[PDB]
Amino acid sequence: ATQINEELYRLLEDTEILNQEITEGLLKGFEVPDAGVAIQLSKRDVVYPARILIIVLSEMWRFGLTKQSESFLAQVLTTIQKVVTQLKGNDLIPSGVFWLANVRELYSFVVFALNSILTEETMTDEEYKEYVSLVTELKDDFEALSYNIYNIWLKKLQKQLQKKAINAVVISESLEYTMDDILTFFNSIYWCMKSFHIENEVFHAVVTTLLNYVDAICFNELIMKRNFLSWKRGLQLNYNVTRLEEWCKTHGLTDGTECLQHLIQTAKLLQVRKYTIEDIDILRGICYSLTPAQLQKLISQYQVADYESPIPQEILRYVADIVKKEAALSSIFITPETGPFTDPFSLIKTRKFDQVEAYIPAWLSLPSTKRIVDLVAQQVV
């Protein structure tokens, strides 16, 4: 163990090689596995980079190479953030989820280390105060990374939806994108998180955030449409929105209906009858998530068909004066939730750290890192 520990020390201390292997080879030559079923990934295949970084970090601390560890981890933090900010296209969903899972594994370890240092009795009491202050300042930074890469990734997903969602929900006519394309997008998110063993609460967060986004942006599209909002349309809007409601209930979400109420109640407004005062009274009850201002505009921009007579003046006049008297007892658009976002990982308990076996994919080429991982393994008999 003398010569093993010496070779190991020499690898760990010389961080300008080791950083360049990790930065390029592992954090940029990162091959994210496929995000589909019939190819069960284990946890180690999803969190392989994090677990390498832990083996290396555990050893740097064992040997007391603490200034090497902060140069090492400062390069990691920068590189994981750069990778996620540069994501685009087909890989946005799977790459995003891959890194969220790996940062979570890292963060969970640092938390486990910090709690162990404070509780276990291990060396002087000034080197200890600085070791605690090093590991807590580290925890704070990996907390900040989790938060950043989630908000970057989630803002990127909202921008992919915005291109598809307006045309698919508001324009598309399933009796230029379709509702099939929106469902395929949500299927992609569902299967990634399933295949990558993401905690079920993070899925709920992501889909809730995006359904409220679709709700807001499509409602704000609808309410400006001029010769458009007919009875025909409301039926078609109801059918489109129901596809998402029904998807949510077959993929484990019970909040899906709460998230789509501005769309649902707009569809109801266009299908219910509006030619007496009592009809406006129970309409106001049906459309509980709509303000009087929003009702006024949707009603006055309602496209009657041929045959169908227009909304009487009595009615248009009555709605006009419900708005005037609420202002009294003192924007029609819904402001969409673009950010910032609570990190759903922060709300849930960090992953427990039993000693995990030292694995490195055979397709990688990191000779210094491989040898570090090998020499740790050797001392496990």
From Swiss-Prot:
Part of the full-length chain shown:
1153 to 1570 of 1574
Protein's name in the database: Myosin-2
Where is this chain's protein located in or outside the cell? Bud neck; Bud tip
Indicate the transmembrane segments per the record. Answer: none
What does the UniProt entry state concerning the protein's domains? The myosin motor domain binds to actin.
**What's this protein's family per the entry?**
Belongs to the TRAFAC class myosin-kinesin ATPase superfamily. Myosin family.
Annotated phenotype, changing L298S = In MYO2-338; abolishes interaction with YPT11
Q: Could you say what the effect of mutating V132G is?
A: In MYO2-573; causes a mitochondria inheritance defect
Q: Where is this region: Non alpha-helical, tail domain?
A: 1-381
What mutagenesis or variant effect is reported for T122M? Intragenic suppressor of MYO2-2
Question: What binding partners and quaternary form does the record give?
Answer: Homodimer. Interacts with calmodulin (CMD1) and the myosin light chain MLC1 through its IQ repeats. Binds to the membrane receptors SEC4 and VAC17 to transport secretory vesicles and the vacuole, respectively. Binds to KAR9, which transports BIM1-coated cytoplasmic microtubules that are attached to the spindle pole body into the emerging bud, thereby correctly orienting the mitotic spindle. Interacts with YPT11 and MMR1 to accelerate mitochondrial distribution to the bud. Interacts with SHE4 and localizes it to the bud tip. Interacts with RHO3 and SMY1, putative regulators of MYO2 function.
Annotated function: Myosin heavy chain that is required for the cell cycle-regulated transport of various organelles and proteins for their segregation. Functions by binding with its tail domain to receptor proteins on organelles and exerting force with its N-terminal motor domain against actin filaments, thereby transporting its cargo along polarized actin cables. Essential for the delivery of secretory vesicles to sites of active growth during bud emergence and cytokinesis.
